[PDB]
């Protein structure tokens, strides 16, 4: 985790939280804090990258999260302007593009000759009022392959995690998706797509088709809430999503969606931990397994 | 500043576009039900008209008018107002019964002494026989409608699904029914005051149909209006978008110029 | 490319990726060279650099380069100087859309946004022009027509209106041509439909000769000849 | 009571139970309050 | 032709024999009949088209044989079977309460409909 | 024909087009293509005008079309920036007004004493998506007398040539105008600014008077259209305007207007080209010529 420009107090909490979740047994926190000098801040992601390269070079995999390159940008600006190097758009040096592009190009998934080893990366960019047209955002958007775009309205509307599906895209996407989860999430994509379009129809007499969409859409959105700082295993993501896909959650009340999730999971843990183990180990769900899964969901849905 | 005031205004325009779009769709939804009712009603009316035709009937004055409380459904309100004024040339002063707020207001302005009866007006739901019946019943009792030898009702006939023509018809008095020439080919009673019964029955039967026709014309108009609104809103989106884009460029240029000016020193 | 054209007399096709990134790279180099960046931060030498690049692309007597360039508009602001400068050089524009591709059309070309500046009547042949204009008019009317046809109902489709709809929905499918590189990728054997047969295909659909062959018997097939086969298969 | 009002009350009575549909019941609802008028001047808009 | 109609439903659109209860007692119409106007009283109505017979409970209305042999029946609402025991029980209770309670006219209708219903 | 800032290829098409229409023999082409150096482009209109002035100072009548002075602005902008002279408004240098004005004012109808010289000037400005407010366009507008603004919407909506009549003015035009074309042109500018007004409020104006104007207006618009690269004779234009102005074009259904034009002209020539020769020399219509034309127009219109 590359904490860029963040106050030492904030990073102390981060460290403490990591310790609480006992995650220091794989985490490294490269820290260039607010106090730390703007040259240190400038070279900080580059420095961080080298740590990652060692893992990648060892053929291992790792994930480096640059948070946030926006403050790195400002620091480079400070250096450049002070070194009297020519200013540029939004008073950022012209080769800020070159620097950022170089940084994000040190992340890679290597060839098996080289070891196959990877350095997964996930840069975080802070948008100043969602101004994606802003010079540092626009540049980064071009360099990156994919974006996930968090949306303030959703956050306020208590949808945590607040991810606006419309403005989140992955262009690597399903190539790197668990096969089981891929099977059970084509439907999910289509349902949500309709829900977005049929969103404004929420404001008198509504078509039965739209109302079906609305029930499915609202329940799905509710399903996609997750209480932050509690992650959830994929082998427990798939049963819940299967239910939603089969629209078995449509009947369940919004208030009971939350209750449904934990209860269904507990039901699976007692009743069908064969299924859970199968999901976990097989990673692919055969027609028979998806069959069995439907049965289990129905039974739980009845209670 | 320019950019932000443009942008907020453009967002407003966007929201307006969205609302007018949404409204247009919901209007269509309502319109289907409206049309369905009007057929069945019109068929029933036609059966009564069969008598009046075959009878060869044909009739102060009364004016009854029909609008909904709801606005934003074209020029129904004022085309009807225009046609009321036209039939208030025919007889200058008349007793105005206004069924519905939209005609009530416009008409109230044009003739204020003429307004004698008014109705809060039929609600969201399309007109129903029960409602028509009570309005008719009060029309007979309160206004003594038959006393006025002219009775005329105004409503909006939904001429085509893209048009509405405000239309009127004359309600045939019981006196008329008596003296109808082919009255003699409709006979079986004289100990039943069939004119006095049939008059009352067709006071309502005609009125319900007129109301149903009107309500449908209103919902149709609303669809039309909300569609045209969407088009107008689109035009503003495009015009203010061009301004937005230009304004965006201008900010970049002005800001850049400031940096350059500083650099030059 | 110029070695091929000039010294091997062949036609070439030169792809460029983002020419937006040609601009972006150039803008930086100007600023680095210390030159005052012109409006919207773009090179003071913005025009000339595009000019040099895009006047070496031409038909010489020897051969001709032809260049397909990729233009990634900056926020869709056509008014921005960099797209404008590009558009000045451009001769044709191919406007692929994914909505169109989602209507099952491979190629993904959005036909109403497909435009060339050598779509000129004389240039393409008068006959070709007339056929093209009709197909464009047909599609244009069809698209608009479907807007209110969908809402109003298909009962509103008059004899005149449904003549256009029948032909149009048939044309829409007829556009779908599986092609050789994606023979594997779609899984459907490729088709390389040459220009003469293109004129022929549209001539017949316009003359409604093959308007009696089902809509999806024009789906995912090539030329006029091809849909003779497909007609047989539809029946089979 | 007027003849068609007489029939109306009868129709309502026929709408009296579980052996029948909602649309009838909806047709047996009353909204409007007949807004009595005079002169301009308005005697109260008594419920219909 | 036979128009049997409600505002929202047209039950029939000449139909062989129709038997109607009117303020004239009961009248039956078969083929040509002189062109009457009759107030239909709250009724049990039978309509026969061919030998097939259909039974209606009708809220009263108007009946008019036209001189073009169109039996225009207009009524506010009607089938007999849909109207048809618990409903009668309820109607009896409501009739009683209204009996004690325009309220007089209402009660008269309640009794009339209750009797007419009681007949079936 | 001054070609500034244009592709050398495009210019070659132009030359070939001109030589196809064998017009080259009376015309000069000056070229300053996009490839040609920015200072060469800067001096390019000025140099072209010198050649023009030699003709003007032969007393001879001439025309010079400067395509596109908007590209001269970009060139001068480039030059100015490269001379490190501070950027002006809209980043176009501060002497850009001076540049255009010095160029433009070298075109003149010299007095009979000084030679009777003429050198007509048509300078072609490339608006960035219209909007005549824009520093370079406004600077040019102020120098020029008259504008021929062209409307994209109309171009798209198949009016070729797409001459916006809201924004086309000629601030000294009527003096030039031939008496024939003053008489026949009976305030057609006013009339079509009654059509412009009428169609403004048509989507209301259901008045038969407005409708009559609309019917005339729409039909008049059809007459304006001309298939580019096939220009009509002046003599021939006189009857067409007579027809439309005198409202004999309501007698033609809108669809068949194109047929009417050619047929009308063929009819007139065959019936009596004597009239057309007469207006060709007289350049005025006598009461008799006017009547003869009215009569003849009525004759074809009827037929």
Question: Would you report the number of β strands of chain D?
Answer: 2
Main pleated-sheet profile of chain D? 2 strands, antiparallel
Multimerization status: part of a larger assembly
Overall domain count of chain D: 1
Main beta sheet strand tally, sense and closure of chain B: 5 strands, mixed
Based on Cα principal axes, name the global outline of chain D: elongated
Q: Structural class of the helix and strand makeup of chain D? A: alpha+beta
Structural class of chain B: alpha/beta
CATH domain class name of the largest domain in chain B: Alpha Beta
Overall geometric form of chain B: elongated
* Number of helical elements of chain B: 6
Q: Largest interface, per-chain counts?
A: B-D, 33 and 27 residues
Would you identify the CATH H-level superfamily of chain D?
A: ATP synthase, F1 complex, epsilon  subunit superfamily, mitochondrial
What is the overall number of helices of chain D? Answer: 2
CATH topology of chain D: the name is Atp Synthase Epsilon Chain, Chain: I
Tell me what the structure shows.
- Chain B: It is a peripheral membrane protein.
- Chain B: It is found in: Mitochondrion; Mitochondrion inner membrane.
- The structure is cut from a larger assembly and holds two copies of chain A (303 residues), one copy of chain B (265 residues), one copy of chain C (236 residues), one copy of chain D (48 residues) and one copy of chain E (120 residues).
- Chain B has helices at 2-54, 76-90, 101-110, 129-143, 174-179, 194-264, and strands at 61-66, 95-99, 115-119, 150-160, 163-170.
- Chain B has 265 residues and is of the alpha/beta class.
- Chain B folds into two domains: 1-25 and 226-265, Helix Hairpins (Orthogonal Bundle); 26-225, Pyruvate Kinase, Chain: A, domain 1 (3-Layer(aba) Sandwich).
- Chain B has a five-stranded mixed sheet.
- In chain B, helix 1 packs antiparallel against helix 6 (194-264), helix 2 packs across helix 3 (101-110) and helix 4 (129-143) crosses helix 6.
- Chain D is α+β, with helices and mostly antiparallel strands.
- Chain D has two helices and two strands.
- In chain D, strands 1-2 form a two-stranded antiparallel ribbon.
- Chain D is elongated and about 50 Å long.
- By secondary structure, chain E is an alpha+beta fold.
- Chain E is built from three helices and nine strands.
- Chains B and D meet through strand 3, helix 4 and helix 6 of B and helix 1 and strand 1 of D.
Features:
part of a larger assembly, 6 chains, C: 236 residues, mainly alpha, Bovine Mitochondrial F1-ATPase, ATP Synthase Beta Chain, Chain D, domain3, two-stranded parallel ribbon, globular, E: 120 residues, alpha+beta, ATP Synthase, domain 1, 5-stranded mixed sheet, 4-stranded antiparallel sheet, 39% strand
Layout of strands and helices, then pairs:
This is part of a larger assembly, with two copies of chain A (303 residues), one copy of chain B (265 residues), one copy of chain C (236 residues), one copy of chain D (48 residues) and one copy of chain E (120 residues).
Chain A: E1 2-6, H1 8-20, E2 30-33, H2 38-57, E3 63-64, E4 66-67, H3 69-82, H4 96-104, E5 108-109, E6 118-121, H5 135-143, E7 147-149, H6 152-156, E8 164-169, H7 179-183, H8 186-197, H9 208-223, H10 234-245, H11 255-271, H12 273-282, H13 287-302
Parallel strand pairs in A: 1-2, 1-4, 3-6
Antiparallel strand pairs in A: 5-6, 7-8
Chain C: H1 2-8, E1 14-18, H2 20-33, H3 46-53, E2 67-70, H4 81-89, E3 92-93, H5 98-101, E4 115-116, H6 121-124, H7 126-152, H8 159-175, H9 183-186, H10 195-206, H11 226-235
Parallel strand pairs in C: 1-2
Antiparallel strand pairs in C: 3-4
Chain E: E1 2-5, E2 10-12, E3 17-22, E4 25-30, E5 37-40, E6 43-49, E7 52-58, E8 61-65, E9 71-75, H1 80-83, H2 86-100, H3 103-118
Parallel strand pairs in E: 1-9
Antiparallel strand pairs in E: 1-2, 3-4, 3-6, 5-8, 6-7, 8-9
Helix pairs in contact in E: 2-3
């Amino acid at each position: 985790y590359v904490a860029v420009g963040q106050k030492r107090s904030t990073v102390a909490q981060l460290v403490q939280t990591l310790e609480q979740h006992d995650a220091m047994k794989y985490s490294i926190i490269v820290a260039a804090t607010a106090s730390e000098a703007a040259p240190l801040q400038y070279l900080a992601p580059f420095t961080a990258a080298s740590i990652g390269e060692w893992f990648r070079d060892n053929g291992k995999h790792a994930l480096i999260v640059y948070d946030d390159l926006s403050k790195q940008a400002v620091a480079y600006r400070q250096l450049s302007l002070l070194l009297r190097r020519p200013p540029g758009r939004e008073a950022y040096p012209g080769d800020v593009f070159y620097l950022h592009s170089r940084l994000l190009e040190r992340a890679a998934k290597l060839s098996e000759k080289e070891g196959s080893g990877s350095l997964t990366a996930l840069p975080v960019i802070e948008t100043q009022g969602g101004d994606v047209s802003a010079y540092i955002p626009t540049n980064v958007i071009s360099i990156t392959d994919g974006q996930i775009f968090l949306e303030a309205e959703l956050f306020y509307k208590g949808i945590r995690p607040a991810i606006n599906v419309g403005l989140s895209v992955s262009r690597v996407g399903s190539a790197a998706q668990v096969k089981a989860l891929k099977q059970v999430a084509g439907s999910l994509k289509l349902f949500l797509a309709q829900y977005r379009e049929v969103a404004a129809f929420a404001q008198s007499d509504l078509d039965a088709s739209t109302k079906q969409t609305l029930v499915r859409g609202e329940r799905l959105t509710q399903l996609l809430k997750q209480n932050q700082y509690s992650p959830l295993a994929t082998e427990e993501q798939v049963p819940l999503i299967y239910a939603g896909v089969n629209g078995h959650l449509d009947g369940i009340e919004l208030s009971r969606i939350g209750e449904f999730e934990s209860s269904f999971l507990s039901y699976l843990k007692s009743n069908h931990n064969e299924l859970l183990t199968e999901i976990r180990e097989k990673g692919e769900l055969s027609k028979e397994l998806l069959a069995s899964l439907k049965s289990a969901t129905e039974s739980f849905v009845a209670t | 500043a320019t950019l932000k005031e443009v942008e907020m205004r453009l967002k407003s325009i966007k929201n307006i576009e969205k609302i007018t779009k949404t409204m247009k769709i919901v209007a269509s939804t309502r319109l289907s039900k409206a049309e369905k009712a009007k057929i069945s009603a019109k068929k029933m009316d036609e059966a009564e008209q069969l008598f009046y035709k075959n009878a060869e009937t044909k009739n102060k004055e009364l004016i009854v008018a029909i609008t909904s409380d709801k606005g934003l459904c074209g020029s129904i309100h004022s085309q009807l107002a225009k046609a009321v004024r036209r039939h208030l040339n025919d007889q200058p002063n008349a007793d105005i019964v206004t069924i519905g707020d939209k005609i009530k207001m416009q008409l109230l302005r044009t003739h204020p002494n003429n307004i004698k009866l008014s109705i809060n007006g039929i609600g969201k739901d399309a007109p129903t026989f029960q409602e028509s019946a009570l309005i008719a019943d009060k029309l007979l009792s309160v206004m003594k409608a038959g006393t006025y030898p002219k009775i005329s009702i105004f409503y909006n006939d939904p001429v085509s699904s893209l048009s509405f023509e405000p239309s009127e018809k004359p309600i045939f008095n019981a006196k008329t029914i008596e003296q109808s020439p082919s009255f003699g080919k409709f006979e079986i009673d004289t100990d039943a005051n069939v004119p006095r019964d049939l008059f009352e029955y067709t006071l309502a039967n005609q009125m319900l149909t007129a109301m149903a026709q009107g309500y449908a014309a209103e919902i149709s108009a609303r669809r039309n209006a909300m569609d045209n609104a969407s088009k107008n809103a689109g035009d503003m989106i495009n015009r203010y978008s061009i301004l937005y884009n230009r304004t965006r460029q201008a900010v970049i240029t002005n800001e850049l110029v400031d940096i350059i000016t500083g650099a030059s020193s | 490319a110029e070695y091929f054209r000039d010294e091997e007399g062949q036609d070439v096709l030169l792809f460029i990726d983002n020419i937006f990134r040609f601009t972006q790279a150039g803008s930086e180099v100007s600023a680095l060279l210390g030159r005052i960046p012109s409006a919207v931060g773009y090179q003071p030498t913005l025009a000339t650099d595009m000019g040099l690049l895009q006047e070496r692309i031409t038909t010489t007597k020897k051969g001709s380069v032809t260049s397909v360039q990729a233009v990634y508009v900056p926020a869709d602001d056509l008014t921005d100087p960099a797209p404008a400068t590009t558009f000045a050089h451009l001769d044709a524009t191919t406007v692929l859309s994914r909505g169109i591709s989602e209507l099952g059309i491979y190629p993904a070309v959005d036909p109403l946004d497909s435009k060339s500046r050598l779509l000129d009547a004389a240039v393409v042949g008068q006959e070709h022009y007339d056929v093209a204009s009709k197909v464009q008019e047909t599609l244009q009317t069809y698209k608009s027509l479907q807007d209110i046809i969908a809402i109003l109902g298909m009962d509103e489709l008059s004899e005149q209106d449904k003549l256009t709809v029948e032909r149009a929905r048939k044309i829409q499918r007829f556009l779908s041509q599986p092609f050789a590189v994606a023979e594997v990728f779609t899984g459907i054997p490729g088709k390389l439909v040459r220009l003469k047969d293109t004129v022929a295909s549209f001539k017949a659909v316009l003359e409604g000769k093959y308007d009696n062959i089902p809509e999806h018997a024009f789906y995912m097939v090539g030329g006029i000849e091809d849909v003779v086969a497909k007609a047989e298969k539809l029946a089979a | 009571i007027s003849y068609a009002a007489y029939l109306n009350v009868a129709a309502q009575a026929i709408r009296s139970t579980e052996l029948q549909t909602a649309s009838v019941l909806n047709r047996s609802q009353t909204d409007a309050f007949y807004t009595q008028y005079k002169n301009a001047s308005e005697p109260t808009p008594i419920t219909k | 032709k036979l128009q049997f109609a409600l505002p929202h439903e047209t039950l029939y659109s000449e139909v062989t024999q129709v038997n109607l209860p009117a303020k004239s007692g009961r009248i039956g119409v078969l083929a040509n009949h002189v062109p009457t106007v009759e107030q239909l009283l709250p009724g049990v109505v039978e309509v026969m088209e061919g030998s097939n017979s259909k039974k209606f409970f009708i809220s009263g209305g108007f009946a008019t044989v036209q001189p073009d042999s169109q039996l225009c029946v207009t009524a506010i609402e009607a089938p007999l079977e849909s109207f048809s025991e618990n409903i009668k029980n309820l109607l009896a209770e409501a009739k009683k309460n209204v009996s004690s309670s325009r309220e007089a006219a209402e009660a008269a209708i309640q009794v009339e409909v209750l009797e007419n219903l009681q007949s079936v």
